[PDB]
């Protein structure tokens, strides 16, 4: 019932036969209902909580996540550590299918989600300017090192509205324009409630295809077939990043970890 | 007797011209979605089925925000459309496409802010491939019979939609066409393309010229796209027409890029 | 008895209030077709110029940005006979020459809004209001003649990104504000603010009111250090609104005002 890294991702990221005290769990939130029940997981006396944000059946699409109830569930679980998977694609040659991606910004197009846990009485506006938690994302970007996974080490991610895909024209001006480097659909916003519940947050892109500026544009069945692909890589580095994670995050190196102390307007 | 139409036009009121159209009957449809901007108006053209639907409202009552996108789709596929013209006024972004030029564009950058995007809110999730939005068996019958019909036609263009209602800013304009590089400018293409493309429909817009965006003599006016649209309307409609005649009874699915989306798109 | 009426309207925060410049105060609530304003309004007197006071976030700046009822204000304010509006704002800077402490009154924006109510047309009238030089060029150089007299440095020109928040731009969001779209100042509350007066056919103006710089700077920016800062400045603008106040003719000069006759082009028939 309690748990201090969170991981949020596809269905079967869980491994049942590295895990321990497997659980599962339905939590109640201010905000209507999480993706799915949460499982709950210990891997070296490491209490782990798994959520699929598309729900196990991927019946959620990313317009319909409810990422509050998400992300206050995982809060209410205690979860310090937050790790997002998510299958993205790549706006340049050198980034490639089958890489992996930790970014260290983002770009912003979505159009008509919930951005924030302060509606008001209490209005806060916290600062991200480096939206990423750095401890966690040099923790994932050592253990990526010593697996021997191909992993830019940086790179911004456009994340659109969806569902549909990028028109040829858009995804140039991604590309040549807003300068991004991948592109996606369910970071935002994910990583903005992350960091307002104070929560130490990273994300693993793991490109699937070129966007549309290329050969063969993307089809919603080309990314779950290289997602299979390399959903056996991700596990590894899953588990060896959570082997290696402290009690808690360092402060220092975690922008949100004290968003509030500066973001409430007084 | 189902009514049925293979042929859908979304357009201003006015393109359907009373006796021209042989067995003309209003029909009202209701979706899943609500209802339609209006009545759709069922007619035959050389014994084309057509059904035409006024994206507006037949006064022009309904906004480009509140155009319930969803039904107005949902009801021509619910017919049997399988292709659908879509005219619009726009503004253009280029000294070269001029008032009074029309363009059939084959690119389009969204600026829209808070519209529904699709039919898929699950639980069966699908996520549509885009890269060439229009259809390009259409694009090219209608470029065909504008060339023949010595129609001024731009044969390409990339459409910035924005969400409306008010017009650009000038800061606004001057990014749409030096940053984005965006050719022409308008407020109802999305989700309006969006949505016929996950029903599998072969959809082209032509685009009615109507005044440069904000660099030109006097700042684009509503009044003045209202005025220079009348003066076009006449011209739209001889093109509308040549185009049904010529259309063979299905778009031809290698020409046709979102005939077959569904196939691909459901994870 | 006698109804309320104003023919200034100044939209800000809390404090640019004042019980000892303002006569007779008299408090109002007003109902509005959109629901109510983010406060009271507060009615006042300036060297007999009927002045109404609207804090866009509420006296304890409760309302975030995304929440406040943009159209219930700016009707709100119409319903009481307001001409002339003048709206003041903590901004970002996105040039090292615009700094914190200065004033811009900006003659552009862009709106990256996401998912706010922009206009007051929803049907079955239809509307569609020019903006290409969106603010009140008479309001605007009123104040920039009044910044001048005072000394208060104030920048002339400038576009003006607004964003939807309430979270702060991203490293890379404000190099592409700057770089790319080429913004000069960023903000929250502009948009639909702006595009509600134009529509009600008011002439609009914002001082912007530069707090820090943007994540491209010193230490990016928080909540607190625009909260440190205002205050710092909002005795200036308090000096600069009152000195407008005392300037402004009766009524706004419709040939220096884009949007004072924008309905007699803008409705579709």
């Not at 209490?122 to 990423?132: G, L, Y």
């Not at 040829?168 to 991604?174: F, G, H, K, L, N």
């Not at 947050?201 to 080309?222: K, L, Q, W």
Request: proline residues 6%.
């Amino acid at each position: 019932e309690k748990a201090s890294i969170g991981i949020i991702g596809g269905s079967g990221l869980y491994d049942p036969q590295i895990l321990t005290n497997v659980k599962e769990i339905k939590v109640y939130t201010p905000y209507g209902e999480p993706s799915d029940n949460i499982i709950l997981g210990e891997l070296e006396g490491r209490k782990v909580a798994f959520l699929p944000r598309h729900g196990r059946g991927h019946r959620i699409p990313p317009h319909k996540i409810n990422y509050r109830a998400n992300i206050w569930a995982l809060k209410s679980l205690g979860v310090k550590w937050v790790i997002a998977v998510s299958a993205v694609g790549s706006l340049r040659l050198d980034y490639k299918p089958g890489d992996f991606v930790v970014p260290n910004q983002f770009i912003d197009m979505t159009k008509g989600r919930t951005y924030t846990f302060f509606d008001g009485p209490t209005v806060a506006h916290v600062s991200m300017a480096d939206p990423f938690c750095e401890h966690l994302r040099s923790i994932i970007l050592d253990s990526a090192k010593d697996l021997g996974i191909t992993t830019h080490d940086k790179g911004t991610y456009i994340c659109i509205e969806g569902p549909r895909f990028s028109t040829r024209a858009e995804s140039i001006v991604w590309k040549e324009v807003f300068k991004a480097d991948i592109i996606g659909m369910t970071l935002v916003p994910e990583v903005n409630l992350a960091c307002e519940a104070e929560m130490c947050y990273s994300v693993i892109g793991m490109v699937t295809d070129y966007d549309v500026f290329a050969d063969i544009p993307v089809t919603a069945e080309e990314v779950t077939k290289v997602m299979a692909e390399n959903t056996a890589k991700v596990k590894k580095l899953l588990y060896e990043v959570i082997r290696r994670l402290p009690e808690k995050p360092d402060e220092r190196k975690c922008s949100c970890c004290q968003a509030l102390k500066t973001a409430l307007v007084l």
